[PDB]
Amino acid sequence: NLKPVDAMQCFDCHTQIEDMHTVGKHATVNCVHCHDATEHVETASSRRMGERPVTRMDLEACATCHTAQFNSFVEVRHESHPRLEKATPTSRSPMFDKLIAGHGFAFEHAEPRSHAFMLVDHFVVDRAYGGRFQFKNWQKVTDGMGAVRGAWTVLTDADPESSDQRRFLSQTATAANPVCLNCKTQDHILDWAYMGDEHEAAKWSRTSEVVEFARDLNHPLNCFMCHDPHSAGPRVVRDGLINAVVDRGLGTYPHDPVKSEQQGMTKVTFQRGREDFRAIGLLDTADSNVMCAQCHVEYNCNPGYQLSDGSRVGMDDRRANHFFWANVFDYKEAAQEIDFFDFRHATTGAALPKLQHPEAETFWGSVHERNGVACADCHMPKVQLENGKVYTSHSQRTPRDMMGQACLNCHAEWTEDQALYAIDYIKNYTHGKIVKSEYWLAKMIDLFPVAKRAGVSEDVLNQARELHYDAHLYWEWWTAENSVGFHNPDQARESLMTSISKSKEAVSLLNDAIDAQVAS
Amino acid sequence: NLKPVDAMQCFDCHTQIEDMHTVGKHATVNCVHCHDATEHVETASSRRMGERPVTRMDLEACATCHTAQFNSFVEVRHESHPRLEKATPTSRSPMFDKLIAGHGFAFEHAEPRSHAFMLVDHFVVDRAYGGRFQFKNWQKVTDGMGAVRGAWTVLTDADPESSDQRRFLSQTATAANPVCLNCKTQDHILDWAYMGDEHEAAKWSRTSEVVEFARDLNHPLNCFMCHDPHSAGPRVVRDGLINAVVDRGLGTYPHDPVKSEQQGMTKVTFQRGREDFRAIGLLDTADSNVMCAQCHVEYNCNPGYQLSDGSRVGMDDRRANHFFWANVFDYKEAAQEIDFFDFRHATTGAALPKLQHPEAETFWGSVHERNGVACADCHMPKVQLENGKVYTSHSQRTPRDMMGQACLNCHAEWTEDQALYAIDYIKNYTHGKIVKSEYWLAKMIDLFPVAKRAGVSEDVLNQARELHYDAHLYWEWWTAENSVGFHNPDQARESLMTSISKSKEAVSLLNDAIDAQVAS
Amino acid sequence: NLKPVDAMQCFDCHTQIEDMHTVGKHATVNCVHCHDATEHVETASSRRMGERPVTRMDLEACATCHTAQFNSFVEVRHESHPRLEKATPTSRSPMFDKLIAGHGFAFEHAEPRSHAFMLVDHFVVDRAYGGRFQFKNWQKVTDGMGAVRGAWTVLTDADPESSDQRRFLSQTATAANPVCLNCKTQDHILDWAYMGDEHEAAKWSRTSEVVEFARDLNHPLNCFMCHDPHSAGPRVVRDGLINAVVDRGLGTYPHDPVK
Ligand code: HEC
Ligand code: HEC
Ligand code: HEC
Ligand code: HEC
Ligand code: HEC
Ligand code: HEC
Ligand code: HEC
Ligand code: HEC
Ligand code: HEC
Ligand code: HEC
Ligand code: HEC
Ligand code: HEC
Ligand code: HEC
Ligand code: HEC
Ligand SMILES: [Ca+2]
Ligand SMILES: [Ca+2]
């Protein structure tokens, strides 16, 4: 049984915590729920930590008083098909392997499944750790609660004796690095300096051995990623997001200065040895658009190359942890502003960006976003109970599972079937354009070896490579983005038509150049 | 409240209407239900119209006394997936973009959905009006009743100030022309001369500005397309069909002179200034095979080219509005008889036909057609009511939704699951052959650039182009035709095997010619 | 196929119908839909009917243009349990027999079922006609559409040769009388004087032989009970109601003079 500690004693040294804790809705929640600080209190001074207190980061620390939210979070949506590869004819990107050739995603890229699995899925995907980590057996893939209890309760490491990234199976990659983990867990929140920069007080950083870092991490999507444990108020903890919104002053809604001001973020910095160490972003309001944008964004979390000179940009560089915080039509400019690209296409040699799940940036400017709707309205609605205390569902899943609460409450003119039909109209239309964009990209890509072998000049190949960048960007955004156009159908339409235009331009350029070589 | 007019006064000048109206089941239906003729009657002479009476073409004009039929017609089948592109791996024609390259359908070709949407879908498809028309917002896509009330109640025009066909978005085409509208609406039935020929009394014709014509049209599938408003008797109004069956004497069942005689059509012509202007085809019987053949047929409704000399055949030519009225094995001959093809393939340069939904011509000679079954038996059956006045369902949709009334009433030996399994056997088999036909067509198409670049002779390329015509015809008929072989499975099988044979012949020809060039 | 008649000619004598028909939403609906008046027009004067025109009272006369309303009306609710006696422990009035002893309802009083059956149920109930009328067989009890087509298409009379109310089975009663029928049909609307008073022009009245009257009646709940066929406007036709509301001045809402 827990025994309370005297928080006044802590507050003597922890003024920032005092100011948060005493004012919020956790003012009566004793520190012992999450911290074991006995030896810390015996040894600390006002500027030196002394013995490190233990801080609980398990979600059960919150589930004791918030079982409803915890249970809704950990529910596994069995209809979210697991380990479903996107590069197949029946999934999101039928020609993905040809289009992404040269990139680590060619090894495996599955559709997302329920949040409980995020950390385990990150660890076991074929592109991440060379196949080092596996579930203990193939039955464990169902065990959401187990994954939440801790990744290492359900996973095995092929070689606990080594800590290097290497292939354990031939068709795997070792793309994982420490930045990835920031969107899977915040178990490292006290051990990682802001942005993963080198820091005396940080156990882990962008340049750490990711296998060793992995072994230290257990829990997915900690509840405190969106809720300050001290004030219980809304926040974000993701460094990349704070950096974009606050440090770079882009604001929470870069396209709406007024909304950015009303629904803003306040950066709170915590120090170690009186030197800035870590930060959180306190939100003005409980704005799930910004909470979900901690992870559902396009980002860099990887080494890459400079657009200017093609030189390597390694994990040690700040750019290896970066939120572009730019919609699809501002993205090329945002990548130019940091002088960065992700990979060279294996066939065309083009410098290309790699886009990932840009839901937050896609949502900006959509009809729903403009009308003050937020992710949670459709994906974590309040529960409707005939007789019950209302709480917010933490199931984070498609509104198809709860259309009454997620759509039909606003769309009184529709039945569930009508609303589903509206969704399907958009997704079907968008998917048709994605498929057409891929057809044209693939047609362009296939001409590169023919052009090279026909003696087409490097100048013409480079012209086509520049078009490839744009054709790729304006296509890939939409296979990366999870709503298949729903979050912003007009933007998807304009973008995908732009992709096709670019590819058609490249096809015509290469075809003409090949024919001119043949004629000469 | 409507006030009746004295029809005897009209009949003094309108003898044809008198002869139809006084004899049929609308003999007691007063003209005021559909015509406002007060100023007309004040100003007309026996040969000069004077002020033009207003004629209601809205479906509500009939819904007042026939609500059951109207309601069954306007029902939206939400299971008929909307805006679902056919050129995707999960739809009807996975390799459609490669195979149709050079044709406007490459811009967008979706599966059909419920009839209520036909006119709006025609207006908004990407291949039709350059993206000029859109639904007012993405919610309106569900609104069948709204579309029926009028296209312009649910659509917007990007530029009401101009009337030219142009692209408003890059990846669109402007394939629409006035002939298309004849299979979407007959709001223009009093404003369009037979076949769309130029006529002093016709506001619109094949050569009209289609954007201006579009703006004048509102209602889909008017009830009077199949039912004469004066006699209430069965008819067709579609000029192309009347022209094939009656003018060209092909008959309602070209393969069965006896059935053509028993279930025939009588052309009734109406004049303006004592000159033939428009026509209808009165049917001997209420034969839905011929009613549905007003639209569910292969047709020309577009400019094209002559097979003989390759010269352009424009909208001004009669051939731009043409029902081939020929099954797949008679089609090449029917296209030769008018010296016509649709497009040149973008890759192979072959002159090719473009086939569209030839359900009527495919149905001929099938077991069901031979046994006197008609479209309505499977797609608009009589309602079965424990206690009720029976009426004919106007829902026009797959029999899967009403298997009791559409199949099982004739097929007493089967359960619903057995009947569905029989359908699926045919569709699965046919689809497998469609996919194989496409594989071979694509393999042939891919050899054309290789052959051209290897120096293969024009004589050999032209030989392969002639094979392409046939390979394409005997494949495309079946992606165009909506039943995936069900309407005539033996014919689909023979045709698709013919396609593959033709493609294989072309592949062998080109491969050999390429190898001979390489060896020399 | 119906052939329209000259309604203006009718109106030369039928001013009341003119004032209703020409103004309402049936102004375009020709008389031939509901009346066969050819011989009537040949023989009538404004003061002498001549040949009595035939008036259709069948609901099909309306169903032709109003199929949706007709079909919703005729649907049988199979969940409305049929012939369910109220005087049982599981129904509405477990002690009904004791309490109602001395009244004809003691012989049978079932729960209501769908409107399509009202006239046939009236005819076959044990308390009404001594058991004289039965469904043609026990299968016909399902046939709502049949009952609507006409009671005598689905019922049999045990003795077509007599017209007296008598028992045909021991535990029946003969409570039916002509007034009952006013809440089952209005096929007699042109043959019954207001309230069922004796009248030279009334074939039927309160004192008629109910068995003879019964045989003349076919259709349940005629559509025109609530809708005037001439104006299409809302109405009632039930004499007892008009008498209460108008003649006795009680009004449509006796507890609310404004309403
Ligand atoms: C019991 C000892 C608790 C533990 C452990 C945690 N929380 Fe809590 N929380 C608690 C109470 C009594 C309340 C106030 C309830 C009220 O509405 O009066 C809360 C409140 C929250 C809220 C809402 C805050 C707001 O400003 O609206 C959140 C988001 C919340 N708590 C989250 C949370 C998390 C993430 C925890 C684990 C770190 C957690 N709580 C622990 C009681 C208790
Ligand atoms: C980083 C810590 C994340 C935050 C914050 C949010 N999401 Fe997320 N989401 C994340 C991952 C890594 C995954 C895939 C997990 C896996 O194992 O595959 C997801 C998944 C979703 C899904 C799909 C769920 C399913 O049933 O398939 C949805 C609908 C989703 N995420 C929505 C969402 C919303 C609305 C958020 C703010 C409340 C949110 N997520 C936060 C990573 C993270
Ligand atoms: C936050 C900005 C993220 C970083 C950095 C990484 N991931 Fe992620 N991941 C994120 C979200 C919001 C989702 C769900 C949405 C989606 O489109 O997938 C994911 C999902 C995964 C998955 C499951 C799906 C799949 O791709 O197979 C895996 C295996 C995964 N993520 C691994 C991964 C690795 C190896 C990373 C560093 C290279 C990485 N993620 C970074 C959010 C973020
Ligand atoms: C961001 C991705 C979230 C994570 C991780 C968690 N929660 Fe949450 N929570 C979130 C939102 C957007 C809201 C609603 C805010 C609003 O006012 O609209 C909530 C709400 C809570 C509450 C308040 C009571 C309620 O509304 O249900 C509690 C107690 C709460 N959440 C607890 C909770 C716990 C225990 C979590 C880990 C399992 C957890 N939250 C994760 C967003 C996010
Ligand atoms: C309602 C107006 C929505 C808002 C606001 C947000 N999203 Fe959404 N999302 C919506 C729909 C209708 C769909 C398609 C779901 C389907 O079943 O067809 C989506 C999809 C997602 C997904 C993929 C979910 C899955 O396929 O299982 C993710 C990860 C997702 N959305 C996340 C997301 C975030 C982070 C949002 C705020 C920025 C957001 N969505 C807004 C409906 C709505
Ligand atoms: C009421 C004033 C009507 C209007 C307006 C329309 N129709 Fe009609 N129709 C009406 C009647 C009374 C009948 C006869 C019913 C019977 O079976 O006796 C009809 C009949 C039809 C039929 C059946 C004809 C046949 O020969 O079997 C059709 C196909 C029909 N009506 C169609 C129709 C259409 C398309 C209308 C709008 C142009 C329309 N009707 C108007 C009454 C009325
Ligand atoms: C031209 C005026 C048509 C006539 C006459 C018929 N049909 Fe039709 N049909 C037509 C179009 C333009 C469409 C597609 C509409 C759209 O917006 O996409 C259709 C569609 C059908 C379908 C598919 C319906 C669905 O649920 O997807 C069926 C089954 C169908 N048509 C059958 C059919 C029959 C049996 C007809 C004679 C009674 C008939 N149609 C007439 C155009 C026209
Ligand atoms: C009658 C002989 C037709 C002419 C002329 C045109 N269309 Fe049509 N259309 C017709 C039918 C029977 C159907 C449904 C069956 C099917 O296979 O689609 C259609 C359907 C459409 C659709 C919806 C499906 C799609 O292709 O995306 C559209 C957008 C459409 N039709 C447009 C169109 C245009 C632009 C035309 C002139 C070039 C045209 N149609 C002519 C029948 C007939
Ligand atoms: C051809 C594509 C049709 C269109 C457009 C409309 N109807 Fe129709 N109708 C059609 C058929 C094949 C039939 C049955 C013929 C047969 O005897 O088997 C019908 C029937 C009618 C009837 C008769 C009563 C009945 O059988 O239900 C009516 C009153 C009728 N149809 C009305 C109607 C209206 C109001 C329409 C526009 C909404 C309409 N029809 C369109 C074929 C076609
Ligand atoms: C029963 C013997 C049929 C007759 C006669 C006609 N069709 Fe048909 N059709 C039939 C089946 C079993 C199917 C496949 C439906 C499925 O769900 O698998 C079809 C398909 C159509 C379609 C496409 C419908 C859709 O996919 O939603 C159309 C447009 C169609 N059929 C039209 C049509 C016409 C015009 C006919 C007379 C010439 C006709 N069909 C005859 C069954 C039967
Ligand atoms: C069915 C739709 C009808 C049409 C059209 C017309 N009439 Fe009618 N009429 C109808 C019924 C069912 C009855 C019985 C009485 C009732 O109120 O329901 C009648 C009655 C008459 C009478 C008798 C009135 C009386 O004195 O008791 C007359 C003189 C009469 N109806 C004339 C008439 C004329 C001239 C019509 C065409 C303009 C006509 N009716 C239409 C049903 C219907
Ligand atoms: C077709 C020849 C009809 C016959 C026979 C009957 N009715 Fe009718 N009715 C008809 C029309 C064209 C209209 C007007 C439709 C509109 O809204 O414009 C009507 C109207 C009615 C109404 C509504 C009247 C109102 O709102 O004021 C009712 C209640 C009605 N009709 C009833 C009715 C009955 C009971 C009939 C049998 C005696 C009947 N109608 C015959 C067309 C036709
Ligand atoms: C006299 C002509 C009636 C008028 C006018 C209405 N109702 Fe009636 N109703 C009547 C009878 C004789 C019966 C029983 C029929 C039988 O065969 O048993 C009924 C029955 C009902 C019921 C029960 C239906 C069921 O499913 O069991 C209801 C709910 C009902 N009646 C309601 C009702 C309403 C709302 C009316 C005005 C629109 C109405 N009735 C008129 C006799 C008559
Ligand atoms: C209108 C004021 C009515 C008169 C006069 C009669 N009945 Fe009736 N009946 C009426 C209604 C509204 C209902 C349904 C509601 C209910 O409580 O039953 C009925 C029902 C019947 C039934 C079926 C139920 C039953 O009692 O078995 C029968 C057999 C029946 N009515 C017969 C009947 C007889 C014999 C009448 C004259 C003595 C009689 N009804 C008068 C409305 C009215
Ligand atoms: Ca990226
Ligand atoms: Ca064609």
Side-chain angles (χ1 to χ4, degrees), chain B residues 161-175:
Chain B
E161 317 324 308
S162 60
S163 65
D164 52 297
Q165 278 276 63
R166 67 175 183 272
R167 288 188 295 148
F168 290 78
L169 291 106
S170 61
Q171 299 300 317
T172 54
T174 50

Side-chain angles (χ1 to χ4, degrees), chain B residues 17 96 104-105 126 236 299 308 324-325 378 450 488 505:
Chain B
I17 303 308
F96 193 63
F105 273 45
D126 285 342
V236 297
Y299 69 97
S308 59
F324 291 90
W325 207 233
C378 299
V450 181
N488 199 335
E505 182 176 349

Side-chain angles (χ1 to χ4, degrees), chain A residues 217-383 385-451 453-519:
Chain A
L217 305 171
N218 311 111
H219 314 112
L221 188 54
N222 313 67
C223 304
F224 59 79
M225 292 196 67
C226 298
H227 300 301
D228 190 86
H230 304 115
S231 62
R235 73 177 186 172
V236 297
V237 302
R238 181 59 158 92
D239 50 21
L241 181 60
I242 292 162
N243 172 252
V245 169
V246 179
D247 302 345
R248 292 144 54 197
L250 294 169
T252 44
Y253 291 83
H255 300 272
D256 185 343
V258 170
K259 197 169 180 174
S260 283
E261 172 62 32
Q262 292 166 336
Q263 290 171 222
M265 182 181 299
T266 298
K267 181 179 175 186
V268 174
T269 295
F270 295 90
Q271 300 195 309
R272 296 293 181 272
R274 306 297 159 102
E275 193 205 334
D276 289 359
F277 174 57
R278 60 178 281 259
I280 63 177
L282 299 184
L283 300 178
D284 291 341
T285 62
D287 184 0
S288 61
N289 288 331
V290 177
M291 295 174 172
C292 310
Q294 290 185 88
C295 305
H296 287 265
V297 288
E298 153 57 12
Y299 69 97
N300 281 345
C301 52
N302 43 271
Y305 302 94
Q306 299 201 139
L307 279 170
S308 59
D309 67 356
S311 59
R312 169 159 210 280
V313 179
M315 291 308 304
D316 60 324
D317 197 295
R318 256 290 177 102
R319 285 170 291 176
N321 183 2
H322 184 72
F323 283 24
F324 291 90
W325 207 233
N327 74 19
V328 64
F329 293 115
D330 288 333
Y331 183 86
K332 188 173 187 181
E333 183 175 324
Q336 287 169 339
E337 104 190 358
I338 57 159
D339 187 21
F340 183 94
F341 72 94
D342 285 88
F343 74 111
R344 276 201 193 275
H345 196 269
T347 304
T348 74
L352 291 181
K354 173 79 186 78
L355 288 307
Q356 286 105 336
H357 42 66
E359 287 83 46
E361 307 97 312
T362 296
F363 188 56
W364 297 330
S366 67
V367 175
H368 286 110
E369 183 274 321
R370 294 287 72 210
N371 282 303
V373 183
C375 316
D377 297 319
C378 299
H379 292 292
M380 45 172 306
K382 293 185 152 60
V383 305
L385 292 168
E386 287 152 306
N387 298 276
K389 180 179 168 58
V390 173
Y391 64 96
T392 300
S393 177
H394 280 57
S395 193
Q396 307 110 11
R397 66 166 71 190
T398 167
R400 287 183 199 260
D401 286 13
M402 63 282 197
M403 292 290 280
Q405 285 303 114
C407 301
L408 299 184
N409 276 181
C410 304
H411 289 277
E413 75 284 3
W414 270 341
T415 62
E416 181 162 354
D417 281 347
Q418 290 178 300
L420 293 174
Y421 189 81
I423 296 166
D424 287 324
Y425 192 107
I426 289 158
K427 300 185 77 174
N428 288 341
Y429 179 75
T430 303
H431 182 67
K433 298 310 181 191
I434 290 171
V435 168
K436 284 188 183 294
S437 292
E438 295 188 6
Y439 169 77
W440 284 99
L441 266 160
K443 184 174 174 70
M444 178 201 76
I445 285 161
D446 285 347
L447 286 171
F448 269 82
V450 181
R453 289 158 179 168
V456 168
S457 72
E458 283 302 314
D459 287 340
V460 172
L461 298 177
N462 287 147
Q463 286 166 38
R465 289 173 181 127
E466 297 199 359
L467 292 167
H468 191 177
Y469 185 103
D470 314 323
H472 179 97
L473 170 57
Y474 294 118
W475 153 72
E476 212 207 355
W477 191 274
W478 306 101
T479 51
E481 210 273 351
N482 279 281
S483 70
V484 196
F486 184 82
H487 291 153
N488 199 335
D490 289 328
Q491 186 181 77
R493 182 180 190 215
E494 185 180 0
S495 177
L496 291 160
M497 287 194 177
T498 301
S499 179
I500 292 164
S501 298
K502 295 286 182 174
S503 289
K504 281 179 169 182
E505 182 176 349
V507 169
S508 176
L509 176 75
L510 295 163
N511 272 328
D512 289 355
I514 293 159
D515 293 342
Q517 290 295 322
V518 179

